[PDB]
Amino acid sequence: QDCYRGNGKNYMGNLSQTRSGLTCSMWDKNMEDLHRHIFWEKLNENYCRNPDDDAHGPWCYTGNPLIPWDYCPISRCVVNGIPTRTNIGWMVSLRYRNKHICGGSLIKESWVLTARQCFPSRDLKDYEAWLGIHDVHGRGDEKCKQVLNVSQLVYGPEGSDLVLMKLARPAVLDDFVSTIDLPNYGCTIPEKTSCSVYGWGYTGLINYDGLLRVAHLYIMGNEKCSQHHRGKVTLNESEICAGAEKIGSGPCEGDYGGPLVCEQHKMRMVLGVIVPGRGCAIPNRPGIFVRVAYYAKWIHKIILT
Amino acid sequence: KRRNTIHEFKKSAKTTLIKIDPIKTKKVNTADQCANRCTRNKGLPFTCKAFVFDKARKQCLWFPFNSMSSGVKKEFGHEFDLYENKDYIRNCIIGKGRSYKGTVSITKSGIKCQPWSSMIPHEHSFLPSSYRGKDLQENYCRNPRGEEGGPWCFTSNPEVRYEVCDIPQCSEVECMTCNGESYRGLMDHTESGKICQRWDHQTPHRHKFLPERYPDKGFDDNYCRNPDGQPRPWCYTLDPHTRWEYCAIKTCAD
Amino acid sequence: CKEALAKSEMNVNMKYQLPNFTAETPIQNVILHEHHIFLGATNYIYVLNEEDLQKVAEYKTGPVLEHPDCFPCQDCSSKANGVWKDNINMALVVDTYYDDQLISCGSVNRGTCQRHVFPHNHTADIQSEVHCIFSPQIEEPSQCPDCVVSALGAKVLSSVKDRFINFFVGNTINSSYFPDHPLHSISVRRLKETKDGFMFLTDQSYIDVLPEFRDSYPIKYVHAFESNNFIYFLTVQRETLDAQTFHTRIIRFCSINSGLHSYMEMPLECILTKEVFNILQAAYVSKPGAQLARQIGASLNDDILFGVFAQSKPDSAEPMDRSAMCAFPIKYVNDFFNKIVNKNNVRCLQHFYGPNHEHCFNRTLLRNSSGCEARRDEYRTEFTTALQRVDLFMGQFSEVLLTSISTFIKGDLTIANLGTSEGRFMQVVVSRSGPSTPHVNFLLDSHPVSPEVIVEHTLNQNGYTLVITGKKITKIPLNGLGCRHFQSCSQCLSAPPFVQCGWCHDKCVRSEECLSGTWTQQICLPAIYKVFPNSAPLEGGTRLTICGWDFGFRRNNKFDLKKTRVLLGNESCTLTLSESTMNTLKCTVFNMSIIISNGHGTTQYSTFSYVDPVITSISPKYGPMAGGTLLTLTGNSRHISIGGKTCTLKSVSNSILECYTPAQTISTEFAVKLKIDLANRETSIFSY
């Protein structure tokens, strides 16, 4: 019941129930804690109108520790790749009943970034993450293999197809295992910028020994992908589209939750998540991802938990 | 045409009603006319369940609301003479009771009545527009067909479609002391199923008694009494054929 | 003379030339897509252009060798040892999320499904490129993620959730089929994005009837559709595992690919009034017209479920050929799921949980407080208090079986494309307000109408409805297939205005053809077929039957028989209500013209007689008294007697008369008096 006002203050929301199912708490203690914590710059007691005028819109506080706050639900307005010669740290191998299902990105010492599509079950007694691996089964190496349980799942905004999962315990960070930074809030990529995907997936090989496979790529404008897709894509703000030039090579099954990492200026940085769409690896057809930039702030607010 | 209804109406004089938070007036000589205007089907664009006459102002005003509603104020304006419709205040059945308008929304087995506006849970409920005038209100149970079984309603309870509200006669709380003239009651039901003649009016059958000349013997509305102490109560009839008839009342004890 | 004037009733059987396409084999499913209309049929798939139904192209999934060891989509033509079975398509869907493809889903070949790809320049050429969808399940070969569709009966619904093509499929299962190769009663399939298989995302994602109730308790699904983030299903099945008696059921769950999470069955029934109709025959989901919106209380934009029920042969599934159609505003049924049914109407679900097993000893239902949050202890619930509806036609179809239905809107009215068991295709302006007579009731074909129909509605003024009967696919313009068939003025004026035509003095006709300019659609003249009798004595006010039509005044549905009167000369004959119908009159009153006045107009008819009776001659004159002889009379509804005893008329005429004489114990002669409802002039004496 909201349109054209993504800013909280414009919407006096008369509702008291979050996305998950937990009722909002007494706003005043939250105002104390937030004024201590959040530094944006008298809003109602215990109604999910968001004070902070956040990008994603109205949101509410919850008492429970594991979920301090969440949105109250309202309407609003790799195939043909190369093996990697060297061990890599951002890669997170997600393991479901003791086999790989998706790749993920390592953000902090206890936090990984993946896609909603990759969580068939919500259960955590079964998921198990590995870090620091060169072979999808680990037969290649084990020194850098880090086995961790999964502590908790946090879903993105509605319509995000984006998810974070937080670990039972932290990890030791060394050369073998590495994290990656995040974009600036509006960090907008130059057109024709080169950057690559790393994947663990189907790869279109009669046999794949289990090396993680790298595929280069170039960012294209949303307009160019509208042309190639012939109106089959209705492009929204949050997506990016980067497409292989003159060759059909792209991520496919198993690569969901994979990172689009790109080098901006001097260092390399993540920009996207590999998510399924539009088909697989069609020659002279681009690829479509979700831009972390539209959600980086939300990542920050949640990572403050 | 010219037909009488005012037997059905309820009379209280030297009084007035106002609901300050809201009525049509026309130049009428007799309260009898405005009353018929009310009673007759679709007589007036608004559903008048009351009206007041004053012979002095030569004007009549009609209320689509009785004193039973909230927001009504009762005052001693002596020239004004009220007119209610006892059908709503009845809290009785009368035979089939086709013209039952009372505000009972509960059934014999005690499950709520479905509103006649809402199609859930039962659907044979289109009647609010099907039958104009039968005063089928929000929820209260009526007899829109004048079906014999009694005023029935649809239950919110999904299993049972319709169940008939049990609702009393007027007779069950009415007794008669052996003389009857001592009994000062509320019935208007003869033995032949006819309604009494108005005492104050003398039309069509012309009778000797007027309430003003014999006050405190309660010749009010059309209430079968014993004006001269007959064993059981009686009145003159509206009916052009029969002059006068008794009224059958059971007896009480203790 | 009601029979003779039955020519007033519309010609139920008139023949129409409509674009009619025929196939070699029965047609099961049909899909409309991008100016082509594909058909699946026994051993075949066809593609059609619309406006002509020219078979532009075809692709041949003919008979297949079924041999136990031959794998499904490996090629075993070389095998010489084992039967040339045939396939019948049961699921034909179109996908365009991935690429413009068609998916067919065969019967015999283990129920493994295949794809056809549309080239960019030319779309009809489906034969050029074909794959199979077969993934050897190396991990867990024990289960089939790719053995999709059963044989006995199935419904398949495609959807795109989460950038994910999901097939929600229901199967009918015979006990014999399982141990060879498993199946499932209701299941959720992800298509692998590389388009070479399906995966079961979780053991939780399917529901199969427990091993013991396979042979008993068969469920056959009849419709499947999506709305409001829920995927409903409509099926038919036993009231209880040992009830050996049936009703329709509805299935609800939301559309998380992980599995069927909030799985709720409810009984659905439509009654008449309290006679119930158990079995559903077909259904169609549509939006309602303005008129019906209030009349069932639904908003103009809400989805609506139309279902035609047939009453069953008791303790059996076979329809009894007594039917109804009933409307279920989806908000109401969804509400029933959420709020109306109280706690202890709910139960566990028999066929899956098994009647005796731990959970439904006790479980709280987060039924109101939660709407399909994917929990761990999801509870599949079987309700017991059927959602009761009442008929929309008030049982005007109480004797004829309905088999296929569709609905579109038009103006404010809403129309139903009904179809019966013997191949008649009606169209009715449906409203609870008035019993409305079909404005098209032609016979289509000998075979029953298939439930699979398509309606396409271009620019709200040009549309059409493909319907399938036996081996025939036909295009019907919904715009009013005609109005030539109407012959009774009242019928001409009742036909809904969207078909522009009106009466011109002799027959319902399109406006711009008949020249007389008498073409009218609002007021029209009563008409008389005949009168019986036309011979009336001066004193005889005798029963005159009047055969005609349009004898009623008009009210859009209710035909007002009270604005009628009869004028004879100057006096008015005595018109009697209970025997006066828009069909006929029954009145009781020198050739004279009778005039009949109605609330619209009046009819003159030129020949009624106040004939003056004449009797002149009698036979015999002198004879015996035995009372067994034959009298003959002559001159110009009567009776005749002598001495209080009626002589039976041995012969009747205007100019000849014959009685058999009463026996009278007397030997003299009597003047015999005619009693033609009245003692008219007696004759003379005859010697007994």
Author numbering:
A (entry chain D): 389 to 429, 434 to 469, 495 to 722
B (entry chain A): 34 to 55, 59 to 290
C (entry chain E): 26 to 106, 110 to 301, 311 to 626, 634 to 680, 687 to 738
How does the study describe this entry?
The entire c-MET I as well as the K4 and SPH domains of HGF I were absent in the reconstruction from the second class (sub-complex), which was resolved at 4 Å resolution. Distinct to the binding mode between c-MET I and HGF I that involves multiple domains of HGF, only the K1 domain located on the opposite side of HGF I makes direct contact with c-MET II, indicating that HGF-K1 is essential for c-MET activation. In detail, two short loops of HGF I-K1 (residues 154–163; residues 192–192) make numerous contacts with a concave surface formed together by the fourth, fifth, and sixth blades of the c-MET II-SEMA, burying ~1141 Å2 solvent-accessible surface area. Similar to the binding pattern between c-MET I-SEMA and HGF I-K3, the loop of c-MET (residues 300–311) that undergoes proteolytic cleavage during maturation also contributes to the binding between c-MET II-SEMA and HGF I-K1. Intriguingly, the residues of c-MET II-SEMA that are involved in the binding to HGF I-K1 largely overlap with those at the c-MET I-SEMA/HGF I-K3 interface, suggesting that c-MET-SEMA cannot simultaneously bind to HGF-K1 and K3. In consistent with the results of the cell-based activity assay, our in vitro pull-down assay results showed that the HGF E159R mutant exhibited significantly lower binding affinity to the c-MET, as compared with wild-type HGF.
Structurally, the c-MET receptor is composed of a Semaphorin (SEMA) domain, a plexin-semaphorin-integrin (PSI) domain, and four consecutive immunoglobulin-plexin-transcription factors (IPT1-4) domains in the extracellular region, a single transmembrane helix (TM), and an intracellular KD. HGF, the ligand of c-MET, is secreted as a single chain 83 kDa precursor protein containing an N-terminal (N) domain, four consecutive kringle (K1–K4) domains, and a serine protease homology (SPH) domain.
